[PDB]
Amino acid sequence: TVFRQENVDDYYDTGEELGSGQFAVVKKCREKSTGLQYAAKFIKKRRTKSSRRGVSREDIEREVSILKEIQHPNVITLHEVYENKTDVILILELVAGGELFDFLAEKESLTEEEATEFLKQILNGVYYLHSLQIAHFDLKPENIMLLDRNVPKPRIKIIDFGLAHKIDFGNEFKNIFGTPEFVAPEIVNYEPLGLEADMWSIGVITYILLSGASPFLGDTKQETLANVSAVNYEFEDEYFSNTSALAKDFIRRLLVKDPKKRMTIQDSLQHPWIKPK
C-alpha cells in the first residue's frame, strides 16, 4: 500500500497511447527532471467490492510488491507508482521494439542457432525469477518484448506480472487461469500450481518459435483445453522437417503432463540444445 499521492502530471509529460486492455492503458511519458522516457500504465481501480469493472487492490498490491523485488536485464523494471481516486499508475521501463515474434516474422529465414540466442534470453529471465521463487504464470509470446529492434543484438524484456505469485512453501496454490493455448494442464484441471507451469509455457513458446504453428490451439476454446489436458500435440513434417532432434527433445522434456517430470529451469539451461557439450 502507501503509493505516491502527487499528481503524475506534475512529474511527467504523457503522450500517445501505446496500447490498451480490459482495465488498462499504457502511454509513453517523459520524466520532467531527467528527460528520460518511460511507459505509464494506468490501471483502473475496482472502487466497490461488488463491481466487476476495475482491478482489486489485493491484485495490484501483489503485482507491485513482486515488481519492486526484481532487478534483471531480461525482466521489465518498475520505476515509480502513483495513485489517484480512480487509477494506480505504474511508471515502467519503456520497451520500443514491440513483440519479439512480430520482429522475427519480418526477417528472412532464421536459423535454429539464431532462434536459440533469443530463447536463451527468455531462459535467463525465467532462471532469475524462479531463483527468487516467483512464478510468472502468464508466459506467452505477446509478453516477450524487445527493448530496441534497431541494434546488433536486440535485448528481450519479460513483461506483465498480473498473475505472478510468490511460491509459498506451506500452502498449495490452485487456479490462475491465463490464456488456454499457453497454460499447463494443472491450470486447466485446477490442480496444485508451482514453478513448473512456466516451464510448460516455455515449451509452447519454443514450439511456436521454431515452427510458427501453435501446438495445442484447436477450433474452439474447449478443444484447446482438451488438447492441453491430454497432451495431444505432434511435430508435423510440414512444420518441422528442418528441425533438429535436439530441439525436439527439448520441447518433449517440457511438454510433460506430470509437473514433477518436467524439466526445471536449471535443467533447461544445461540441455545439449542450449549448451552444446
Q: Is 25 annotated among the ligand-binding residues?
A: yes
Technique used? X-ray
Contacts of 39 (CB under 8 A, 6+ apart): 18, 26, 27, 28, 29, 91, 92, 93, 94, 95
Q: Is 118 labeled as ligand-binding?
A: no
Closest listed residue to residue 116, CA positions, set 259, 277, 237, 268: 268
> Is residue 164 left, alpha or beta, with left meaning phi > 0 and alpha meaning psi from -120 to 50?
beta
CB 177 within 8 A of CB 197: no
Can you give the chain as a three-state secondary structure string? CCCECCCHHHCEEEEEEEEECCCEEEEEEEECCCCCEEEEEEEEECCCCCCCCCECHHHHHHHHHHHCCCCCCCECCEEEEEECCCEEEEEECCCCCCEHHHHHCCCCCCCHHHHHHHHHHHHHHHHHHHHCCEECCCCCHHHEEECCCCCCCCCEEECCCCCCEECCCCCCECCCCCCHHHCCHHHHCCCCECCHHHHHHHHHHHHHHHHCCCCCCCCCHHHHHHHHHHCCCCCCHHHHCCCCHHHHHHHHHHCCCCHHHCCCHHHHHHCCCCCCC
Q: How far apart are the first and last CA of the chain?
A: 49
The annotation status of 209 as a binding-site residue, yes or no, is no
Q: Which residue has the cell 508451482?
A: 194
Judge whether 93 is annotated as a binding position. yes
Instruction: Find the catalytic residue in 13, 59, 138, 219.
Output: 138
Instruction: Please state, in angstroms and as integers, the Cα–Cα distance from residue 212 to each residue in 141, 207, 260, following that order.
Output: 11, 8, 28
Q: How many CA atoms lie within 13 A of 134 on its CB side?
A: 23
- Residue 108, C-beta contacts closer than 8 angstroms, at least 6 positions apart: none
| Catalytic residue flag (residue 168) | no
Other CB atoms closer than 10 Å to residue 19's CB: what's the count? 10
2 annotated as a binding-site residue:
no
Cα 160 to chain centroid distance, Å, stands at 6
Find, among 134, 137, 123, 223, the residue nearest to 186 by Cα: 137
Are the C-beta atoms of residues 141 and 98 closer than 8 Å to each other? no
Domains along the chain?
7-97 (3.30.200.20), 98-277 (1.10.510.10)
Instruction: Please report, for residues 71, 203, 254, the alpha-carbon distance to residue 141 in angstroms, rounded to integers and kept in the order given.
Output: 21, 11, 16
* Degrees to nearest 5, angle at CA 8 with 6 and 10: 85
Q: Is 119 annotated as a binding residue?
A: no
Provide the angle, in degrees to the nearest 10, between the axes of the packed helices 196-211 and 112-131. Answer: 170
* Closest by CA position to 100, among listed 189, 22, 205, 196: 205
Phi, psi angles (nearest 5°) of residue 146: -105, 135
Q: Residue 31, annotated ligand binder? A: no
Whether residue 112 contacts residue 157, with contact meaning beta carbons closer than 8 Å, is answered with no
Would you put residue 231 in left (φ > 0), alpha (ψ -120 to 50) or beta?
Answer: left
Non-local (6+) Cβ contacts of 121 within 8 A are 74, 155, 156
